[PDB]
């Protein structure tokens, strides 16, 4: 292929100067929107950093404090004044616990009330991916079926917006997905996706297809397409799909999705993310030696791409329910303002990962009279034992440990608030004036062919 499909294909690895140049004006916040976004972003980030007065205590050596402490333990003021494989597995469980909501779906669900009453929602992720065998993919299938029964019984008719949903990885459902061919995927994967989706629809819960490596985008779109034309799913808007703003293709995937929502007569639940596989995408493309990268090479370009994509999503509320997944205070504030006046719950939601977003979103989800924005946030809640945790945990270490990540920079008491929540379009224009051109690749990430 269609006009929209062909256009996705042609953007696959387009030069970054080109892709970034096209995004800029789509991403630019109008003057007054930009300033309200800056102000809200500043406030959110200020409260986050300075929760237990962490910077007000910078406002006030360690040898002296130990002495002052000992002096303060003197009860009477008078007296006072007068005077390899195993270490890896273990470190994975230790660092990983904070990102895991529960070992089994019943445990995760039994703990869902606490934040659900404050206005949070959930999307449960049964951990496990990249099934290597037929038996592995069968077992993921059965754990996903079980989970949908449990979530859907706990949802109890609350529906796709207010009620919990599930997130699935297509790589978990087909053996050796990473290299699977079109005909085997449609024969084997598709019937399992279809079957899980019909079930989610019986319980009226959201079912989201997580986005994985970039060479699987095309087949995921083929799968989505067919799924959307199933008669048993006519009139039901519970199908969710993730799109990754770090891809050059993202805006073109949106044009495709908008047309698919129209043709298939539905509102798609669309989770807009930046993306989780960036380090591997770079390594992969550097090993393939092709014309370029399928993702951006500077983090700021991903930020610009997200904003441009978010505007596109928000323009079509009849066709898309945007779910804006982020832990970045500027990103959140920009979307808040871009969504305009006259919020209604079904307009959009935020999303966050368990163990990462609660502090940001405790300022967002909840009543205005408690100093909150009163916007709903859906927590992505991984569910599984230590044997399903590795790959997800590694992605979290990369996310938390990267110096370009907001969650890393916020902890840096030296980087001032204003730089942290700096507007990405303005940042790109600043680079462009310094460097001579808009959208030049990261200086340390040359094209694969070099
Ligand atoms: C609820 C939820 C669901 C998610 N589901 C998925 C999913 O299905 N598939 C998936 O891939 N991701 C998914 N993610 C996104 C991913 O897991 C990260 O959480 C997200 O990319 C971080 O973005 P941020 O705005 O919070 O942080 P920010 O710090 O503002 O942005 C961080 C990121 O920018 C990108 N980046 C980093 N360095 C560079 C660089 N040099 N050049 C270009 N881009 C760079 C990466 O995407 C990285 O995550 C999900 C996130 C959430 C919150």
UniProtKB/Swiss-Prot annotation:
Induction: By proline, autorepression and catabolite repression, and is potentially nitrogen controlled. Keywords: DNA-binding, FAD, Flavoprotein, Multifunctional enzyme, NAD, Oxidoreductase, Proline metabolism, Repressor, Transcription, Transcription regulation. Residues 84-414 are annotated as: Proline dehydrogenase. It comes from the Bacteria. GO terms for biological process: negative regulation of DNA-templated transcription; proline biosynthetic process; proline catabolic process to glutamate; response to oxidative stress. GO terms for cellular component: cytoplasmic side of plasma membrane; cytosol; plasma membrane. GO terms for molecular function: 1-pyrroline-5-carboxylate dehydrogenase activity; cis-regulatory region sequence-specific DNA binding; DNA binding; DNA-binding transcription repressor activity; flavin adenine dinucleotide binding; identical protein binding; proline dehydrogenase activity; protein homodimerization activity. In the N-terminal section; belongs to the proline dehydrogenase family. Homodimer. Oxidizes proline to glutamate for use as a carbon and nitrogen source and also function as a transcriptional repressor of the put operon. This is Bifunctional protein PutA. The lineage of its organism: Bacteria, Pseudomonadati, Pseudomonadota, Gammaproteobacteria, Enterobacterales. The chain holds residues 88 to 610 of 1320 of the full protein.
